Amino acid sequence: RLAEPQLREENDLGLFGYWQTEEYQPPVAVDGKVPRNEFGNVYLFLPSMMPIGCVQ
């Protein structure tokens, strides 16, 4: 928004309701590789989000 003033008032954040979301499914490591997000990391806000077969 600072770089482009036209986007200052643009609503670029999307909000989803409860009915639009399903239960989270833990990932499973493949070929001994830890699953990664789009940034190449793993989100571990909760222990249930830990990949199956992986230990912290």
What do you see in this structure?
With 56 residues, the chain is mostly loops. The chain has no helices and no strands. The radius of gyration is 17 Å and the shape is elongated.
Spell out the blueprint of helices and strands.
Layout: no helix or strand
Summarize it.
The protein is mostly loops and 56 residues long. The termini are far apart.
The structure class reads little secondary structure
Helix content: under 10%
What gap, in angstroms, lies between the N and C termini?
A: 38 Å
Largest sheet: none
User: Rg from C-alpha positions?
Assistant: 17 Å
Strand content: under 5%
Please supply descriptive tags for the structure shown above:
1 chains, elongated, little secondary structure, part of a larger assembly
